[PDB]
Amino acid sequence: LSPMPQIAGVTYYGDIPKQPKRVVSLASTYTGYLKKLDMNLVGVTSYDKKNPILAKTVKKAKQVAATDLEAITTLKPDLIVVGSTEENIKQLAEIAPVISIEYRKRDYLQVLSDFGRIFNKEGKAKKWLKDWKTKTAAYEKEVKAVTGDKATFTIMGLYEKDVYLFGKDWGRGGEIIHQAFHYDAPEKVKTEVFKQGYLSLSQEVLPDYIGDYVVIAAEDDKTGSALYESKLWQSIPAVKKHHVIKVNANVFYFTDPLSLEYQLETLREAILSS
């Protein structure tokens, strides 16, 4: 049995195995963390399958939704990992031990060391975290030599017809930009976005929320066309200066180590080349 330590936002259902052999991940947030710790994933989510970086590592996993109870049963999990807003966690715990995680109670780094403790893989957690810290510290110096230490970044996302701003800890590059590289956001983003983590926003007020640089996640090229062509958008200084960094949401949605490795390199390159 896993020691099952008390962790903010972690709820255990049933007896978590010390060394799980057959894991179903129903929360894309965590899939890549489990992969980093070399857990055997036999089920993953549709978002995991559409993540081109993570998808390479879980080709053998079946795509399942939380509601696919018969499919999850057939996979014979000894562990299921879910997000706490899932509506059927009671049904899932009847199939196998479940770890339920409430988002953001622990930070993107702490989540790894937490799993390290649950699964007795502190060694792999520690190793990755040490190297992440070193690498991020070095890359921070490189990007800030180009942007200046006080350059502001805004994280944004396009989803269907809606526009969002994100904070330090809701994916879309925020973890890297705001935590790993310690970039400030514009005052209005700190004030209206950081607490909630995300904010749905009219395109008309975007100029007020963008300073030196903006990172934009979208699932494809076409989604933002109208925005980018618009007078208002092209009036934005950061836009006028080609300080816009367009990234692939299919990977940038994520906060896991595997996804972040790609995001780090991508953002380093985009900033250095600005």
Ligand SMILES: O=C1CCC(=O)N(O)C/C=C/CCNC(=O)CCC(=O)N(O)CCCCCNC(=O)CCC(=O)N(O)CCCCCN1
């Ligand atoms: O967990 C993360 C980063 C934070 C995040 O987005 N989460 O959903 C974490 C769990 C949040 C608690 C549940 N809240 C909701 O499900 C409300 C909708 C939601 O997912 N949000 O992220 C809120 C703002 C975004 C709404 C637009 N939808 C998307 O961007 C789809 C990707 C989207 O937002 N997803 O959550 C699906 C893919 C996520 C890949 C892993 N990334």
Ligand SMILES: [Cl-]
């Ligand atoms: Cl990208």
Ligand SMILES: [Fe+3]
């Ligand atoms: Fe989300």
